[PDB]
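Table 4 source record.
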Amino acid sequence: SMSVKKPKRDDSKDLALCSMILTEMETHEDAWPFLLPVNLKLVPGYKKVIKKPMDFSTIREKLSSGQYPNLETFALDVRLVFDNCETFNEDDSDIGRAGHNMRKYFEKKWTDTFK
């Protein structure tokens, strides 16, 4: 509350560390469905159904330009990529499987880097 703070967690490396995690997501072999925005002209249904499209390139641009206020807003966008993927793709599809795999990969890096 006012003049009453928990001890200050060192957040000075969060930016660099989120960048590293993102690099590792970018370079994973199953990243291909996620590297670029879904083409809303060429994919029937996407625009209407997925209210907040997100992809790794858009996360990278937001990261690089100080549009994440803290590491939680960064994780929210990464998770949004996978939540979108599950919303539109059957579990038993290459993309559906890609999304599950990438989510697992992300969540482990996240825990090991920060928790």
